[PDB]
């Protein structure tokens, strides 16, 4: 509208663009390492259930 | 709150729905086994204390 009005909009869009986006890194890395902890400890009981059927650990590969 | 947090929240809810659910199948059919050889273990003594009742093994039914 008036000369004014876009000078307060171009100070509102400057502030609006900068709010402190936060590093959403290890936020995510805690995900993908507690699905590797659970299925290792997952993995364990395929192994020792195994054992109590074959007196053996499974063959590798 | 802001389009990158619920950028990273499908992000992990992914994650975390796919966490290798292990096959409870073995697990589960070696209890419903040993229950069986218990029993048969067991029904012998039975058999085997009734013979040296009577000098027999019971009828069947």
Redesign the interface.
Known sequence: FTLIELLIVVAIIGILAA?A?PQ?SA??VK??N??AS??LR?LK??LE?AF??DQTYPPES
């Open positions: 709010i986006i959403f936020y995510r995900a993908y507690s699905a659970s299925d997952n009981t395929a259930s109590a059927d």
